[PDB]
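To close the section, here is one more complete example, presented without commentary so you can practise reading it yourself. The ligand is adenosine monophosphate.
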Amino acid sequence: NEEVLNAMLKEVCTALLEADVNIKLVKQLRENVKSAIDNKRKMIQHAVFKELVKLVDPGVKAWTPTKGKQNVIMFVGLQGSGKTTTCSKLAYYYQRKGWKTCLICADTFRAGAFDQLKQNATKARIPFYGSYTEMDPVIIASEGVEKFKNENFEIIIVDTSGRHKQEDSLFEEMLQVANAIQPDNIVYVMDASIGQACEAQAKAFKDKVDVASVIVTKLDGHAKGGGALSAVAATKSPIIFIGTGEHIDDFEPFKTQPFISKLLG
Amino acid sequence: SLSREDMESVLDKMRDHLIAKNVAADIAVQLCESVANKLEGKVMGTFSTVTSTVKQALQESLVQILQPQRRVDMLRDIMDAQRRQRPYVVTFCGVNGVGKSTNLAKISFWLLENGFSVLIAACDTFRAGAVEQLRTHTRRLSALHPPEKHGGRTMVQLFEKGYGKDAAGIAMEAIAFARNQGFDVVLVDTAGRMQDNAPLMTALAKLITVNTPDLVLFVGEALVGNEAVDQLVKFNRALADHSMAQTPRLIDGIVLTKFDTIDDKVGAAISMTYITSKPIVFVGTGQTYCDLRSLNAKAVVAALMKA
Ligand SMILES: Nc1nc2c(ncn2[C@@H]2O[C@H](COP(=O)(O)OP(=O)(O)NP(=O)(O)O)[C@@H](O)[C@H]2O)c(=O)[nH]1
Ligand SMILES: Nc1nc2c(ncn2[C@@H]2O[C@H](COP(=O)(O)OP(=O)(O)NP(=O)(O)O)[C@@H](O)[C@H]2O)c(=O)[nH]1
Ligand SMILES: Nc1ncnc2c1ncn2[C@@H]1O[C@H](COP(=O)(O)O)[C@@H](O)[C@H]1O
Ligand SMILES: [Mg+2]
Ligand SMILES: [Mg+2]
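Output:
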């Protein structure tokens, strides 16, 4: 019976490893479900499920905007994780719920970044700010937040360029954008397909700037998004929304139960 | 001798190590079981240990996976394309945000630097800003490579029919255009798609079957996890099913991007060259045109063995 636990348990360690959960976390989850356990694949799979929930839940309630005040949300994340698309996704979400929302493009690097957000925003009938010419993200973000403040917007969402921890230059520029506009919520956007390099980057983001929420994108495919456990761990922030496709309404609020279910099999 | 029982633990440590360095979990497993089979019933060296023996075995098989039989000499292939008086067509493809468009620009720069003219075909006709993105690149490149620096010839140019049109047909008109305007290379950019989106994978297969490019390149981020394996399996499976040839045109080579973000968790390179037995043709190491590297198989394996 000591052999029927382990055989059923290394079979769960493998499912989680294949789902891109950090190996550190699996090695830890294994001897956690083992210590805490002292029809047979239910008495086990339940106690595993419970330990996984403890991992997605940071113990913190999620930030929410208040109607009638100025709420500034700033997006950050690795190159190509899906910030820009998720920006218009989130604006469209709040706008449909009757908030006065708008998007600002503070990417001055990515070729056609402003055109991208401008077309996204234009299709969804959402006010935007950005510049073809201005090269300092801090000036666009500043002059953008300042503009939409003066027009009494409730949700001002600021898109920023992709960056990664080893480019010290880019990480400073991020903190400088944060300090300039003083966001009420910083969102860390992450690709659900991310491998083991995830914990390192997410920690690095949280160490430099004040990440308070996480959005997981590209969950509509084959990836189960196990990197999210490490992202939640590193940023000490709840997953608030998931992205489920390329379109503006491929977006829904994160629910813990179905995600851990899909993560497990 | 060396039984499986003796190697059992050091092999387990290797597997866990490889996994931690971002080699796909099942590949690490298969990798280590190969090392077991290779060593079983053999005797060790005079001063070798069971650890040093499997460590060396693993290192050799890793080097061999990374440098596969078929190389891809791209400039040489373009030289040959020029003798036949046809353009050399390259198709980039891959899932969303991995770096197709930007590495297509880097490769253009490299080609121009060797004196070939490239027509960029904007065949992502879907994602917001795809055309303007490539336009920005074309503008940046033909400032670096203007006509006044090449005897009056235009060396880069964008072929675009804007958003909404069939990708395959634009690719076709572009290749047709390159032939008539004298462009040495056509680089076809395609939209990002999930590997199991049937409609989109058929579209990708159609563009390839219809235009028979000289080189299909799969583009994958080095950040990717176990997804590296599934993306390639299903892309290659899609090119083979939605094709009506005897020996169908599969993925020819890999562009491993964002290598600058993974530190030494360099494992995705092993994941990709293990399933496709195709070479990593370029490694992407940043966001500028200069950030394009070849793949040093000895040195990548070195980084993977270390931690
Ligand atoms: N299938 C799918 N595609 C998505 C999802 N979110 C974004 N995408 C696609 O992923 C790609 C990358 O998105 P994008 O917003 O450009 O990334 P980014 O990280 O904001 N930009 P940057 O390159 O500056 O880092 C685009 O093709 C986008 O439409 C999602 O949830 N599902
Ligand atoms: N650090 C780093 N960033 C890279 C590298 N290659 C591309 N990027 C960045 O990653 C993001 C992806 O860019 P893009 O080329 O638009 O990717 P894509 O696959 O064409 N996206 P889409 O799916 O929408 O077509 C860009 O911000 C680009 O600057 C690389 O090697 N290193
Ligand atoms: N990356 C993509 N490339 C091409 N078509 C897509 C992509 N993602 C989604 N689609 C589909 O293409 C169609 C275009 O819809 P629309 O952009 O609203 O005109 C819809 O059926 C989408 O589901
Ligand atoms: Mg972006
Ligand atoms: Mg592209």
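Once you have examined the tokens, check your reading against these statements. Chain B has two domains: 1-70, 71-307. Chain B touches chain A through 50 residues (CB under 8 Å).
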